[model samples]
Target: KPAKRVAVTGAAGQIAYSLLFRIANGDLLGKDQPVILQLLDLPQAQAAVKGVVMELDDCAFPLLAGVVITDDPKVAFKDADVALLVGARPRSMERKDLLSANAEIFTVQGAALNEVASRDVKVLVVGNPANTNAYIAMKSAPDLPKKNFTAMLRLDHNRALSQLAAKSGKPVASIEKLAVWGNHSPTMYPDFRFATAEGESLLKLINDDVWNRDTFIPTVGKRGAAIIEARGLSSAASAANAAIDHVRDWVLGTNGKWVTMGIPSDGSYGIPEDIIYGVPVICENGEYKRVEGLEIDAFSREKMDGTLAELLEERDGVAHL
Candidate 1:
């Protein structure tokens, strides 16, 4: 097979630092496939990226076909098959500042990807405020297929898996079809109503709405902040692992198992069209479709509505864009 070019922004950041080596070692695409690493960063971070490239070279990964480092989006995205938009402005106290600052960055990168990336290029946005940032990139690149753009919600998906596994004493692998809905924020709902463990309803197994509502939900939603408090640093390695899980399943197929992703709404589950929100999907052949016909109870609807409100607030914050 021909070597695939994977373009990654924020190449010098902690998540990307963990990410690059994983991709190099075939933890992402596949062990047999070859990849060229196109690393993008700000001009000031060129030295840092170069140092990383040197380390990558020293590792001599057999599947690492090549490496390129650039501050220019056009250069980084040239003929790219996959683009991971991992870089963004740090979050600010004010919502407007956070949205606007990142909008400027994604807008440029989006246009560059449209111009230089292959027509089939798939993009995943991982930066904070990822769902909205992904929307910005998708709108900026009108030529690319809408489905080609997605934001990472696999971190939340994995978080839900870990929480559920611990609660039921079942291995994480035994839990399947877990769903995370709405924004990638505290308001997002990790719905046990749709989840199952070893083909049994997860809710039936746990039978504890009290713990789920008060403890499990909040734990998964605010896990990032908790990690920061515990380690004095935000999640890095785990976030990187989720990024890999996302693209790997996306490209290689999910084998009819359900996972969560933030993709443009086609009005599924009453979500407004064109808004990116986390939803359950089954992926195959480089594409995904929303898992449909599931029942939504009153409690799930209430939780979903809360997160939907937050998403709309975020969308309005960037309305001028």
Candidate 2:
């Protein structure tokens, strides 16, 4: 098989540092498939990126066909098959300023990807404010298919899975068909209504509404902050791992399983089009479609709408981009 060119932004950052090695070692794609890594970083980080590239060279994995490091989006994304937008302004900045700064970054990269990458490029925005960043990129690249762009919600999904596992005394793998809805921020909803544990409905298995609302949802939504508070730094390894799970399932197919991802809503489940929102999707043959017809009660609907409003506010904030 031919090598798929994977472009990664923030190549020298902690997430990318953890991600690149895993991808090179076949944590993504497959062990038998070859990949060409195209790494991108800021001009000031070029030396550090080169150092990481040297380490990649030193590891010399058999599946790693080649490496290209550059500070230019045009160069990094040229003919790329996949793009991981992991770079963004730090959260220390105000939310308004962070959105504006990331808008500038993703807008330029989006245009460059439209100009140079394959029309089939699969983009996953891993940076903070990911849903809005992905929206900016999708809007900027008018020619690219809207579905090709997505943001990471798998981390939240996995977090929900772990929480359910701990509460229900079931192994994580036993949970199936779970979904996370709306934005990736604190307002995001980890819906348990559709989930099943060992082929039984999770709601029936647990039947604890208070824990669901008070504990599971908030824990998953605020997990990144909790990790930061505990470690004095943001999530790196686990975040990188979720990005891998996302793209691996995306390109390789999900085998009738449901996963959560943030993509431009098609007005399904009452979410307006053009804004990116996390929802359940089934993937196969390198394409994904929304998992439809799941009933959302008034409670779930209210939660969904709240996150939708936040996403709308974010889009408005970055509309000038």
Candidate 3:
């Protein structure tokens, strides 16, 4: 099969810059598959992306097939099989200036995607305040199936799993079924009750009071801040890697392990129907479905509800129609 046509909306942004080389090197798509990169950005970023394109050509990876750079969504979105919505207006020096800035960019982009994206395009929102942006993007694209859209929370889940593995002296791969529920914000609940470490319930191995109050939740919640503090920039590489992992898993499927993603809801897990929030999901064949009936304990329930409340606020904040 030909490699998927991957589109990165903010191709020259910090994360996307780090990501393009990897995808071109077959980190997401297989070595034999041919990839066509669809890069979208504003004029300044377009020039930078063109520079990145020059680098893709220079590397000359056999799987690195082709690169296209444009400002017009119609041009960039043409025939995209996977769309990573990564470049967004980051929180600025002005604290009050987040949603409004991103809203203007995403709304227009969303409408463009509706008109020009491939019939089977699968979108993952990685931009900050991703769920709301995704909601707007989906609403603009009424022609596409609602379920085709999702925002990323798998990064938090992976961070949680990696932390547990480190603290417990187990390999990261040994951790299974970790959950990051509700909003991608600090309020997200990282539940290990259903997860296992070396065939034993993870929560049983870790102290509940410690996990809830000290380690697991904070590790999952504050990881982005940690990354920023450590690097003096927000998480670019890890976020990019997660975006790659998300799109890769969505198209290619995972090996019996599910991950958390903030996707449009169809009333699963008693969440309000159609709200985009994080939940455990399995993706395959260019689509996803929630892995149903997981236990939502009292702790998990409170955290989940709190995050969803925030998401509800975000949903109402954006202008629709």
Q: In lDDT terms, which candidate is top?
A: 2
Q: Where in model 3 is the C-alpha error above 4 Å?
A: 93-96
Candidate 3: lDDT over CA atoms? 0.80
Clashing pairs in 1: none
Model 2 TM-score, all chains together: 0.98
> How does residue 245 of candidate 2 score in lDDT?
96
- lDDT (C-alpha) at residue 295 in model 1: 91
RMSD of each: 1.0, 0.9, 1.7
> TM-score for every candidate vs. truth?
0.98, 0.98, 0.95
- Span of 10 residues, lowest total lDDT, candidate 3: 92-101
Provide the overall lDDT of each model, using Cα atoms, as 2-decimal numbers: 0.92, 0.92, 0.80
- Candidate 2: segments with Cα more than 4 A from true spot: none
Candidate 2 all-Cα RMSD: 0.9
Rank all candidate structures by their lDDT, best first, as comma-separated numbers. 2, 1, 3
Task: Output the lDDT of residue 169, model 2.
Answer: 92
Q: Write the per-residue lDDT of candidate 3 for residues 295-314, one digit (tens) a residue.
A: 76776687778888888777
Per-residue lDDT tens digits for candidate 2, residues 1-321, read 889999999999999999999999988999888999999999999999999999998997999999999999999999999999998888675777988988989999999999999988999999988999999999989999998999999999998999999988988998899999989889999998878999788999899899888888899988988999999998899999999999999999999999998988888899898778999999999888889999999999999999999998999999975
Give me candidate 1's TM-score against the actual structure: 0.98
| Model 2 lDDT-worst window of ten | 87-96
Each candidate's number of clashing pairs is 0, 0, 0
Model 1, 85-191: lDDT tens digits are 99999964677789899889988999999999999998999998999999999989999998889999999989989999999988899888889998888888998
